[PDB]
């Protein structure tokens, strides 16, 4: 699921660089 993976990304957005 798109929104499922999104929620995983959300946990670490604050780490991109």
């Amino acid at each position: 699921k798109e929104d499922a993976f999104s929620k995983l990304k959300e946990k670490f957005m604050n780490e991109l660089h």
Epitope: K1, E2, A4, F5, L8, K9, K11, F12, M13, E15, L16
Partner: nanobody, 118 residues
């Protein structure tokens, strides 16, 4: 991320028991931005149980905090979920999934069934 993922390590255990999930990648696992484990039962959206960043950062649903433990072994291209003190509420099909932020879905995997009954 154009990598194949295959989960294993599930099974049937008594409430309070443990087991450990593995998910091996066809590609180099250390180079995937985000990865994580989802629990799903019929009629309920994939719930993210635990996640891990490429850096090594980890996240955990509150339910599973202190009980489950996500880790990665980039050497052996494998992701793990060490599950302890299992409740019946933890019953469900467990998937592992990962990708980079450009990926819309990410790579998933067929999943592995965890049943917890007493």
């Amino acid at each position: 991320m154009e990598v194949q993922l295959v989960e294993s390590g599930g099974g049937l255990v008594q409430t309070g028991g443990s087991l450990r999930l593995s998910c091996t990648a066809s590609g180099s696992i250390g180079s995937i931005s985000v990865m994580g484990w989802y629990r799903q039962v019929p009629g309920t959206q994939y719930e993210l149980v635990a996640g891990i960043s490429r850096g090594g950062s980890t996240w955990y649903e509150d339910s599973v905090k202190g009980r489950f433990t996500i880790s990665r072994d980039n050497a052996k291209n494998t992701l793990y979920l060490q599950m302890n003190s299992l409740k019946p509420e933890d019953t469900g099909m467990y998937y592992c999934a990962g990708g980079d932020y450009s990926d819309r879905l990410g790579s998933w995997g067929q999943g592995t069934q965890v049943t917890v009954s007493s």
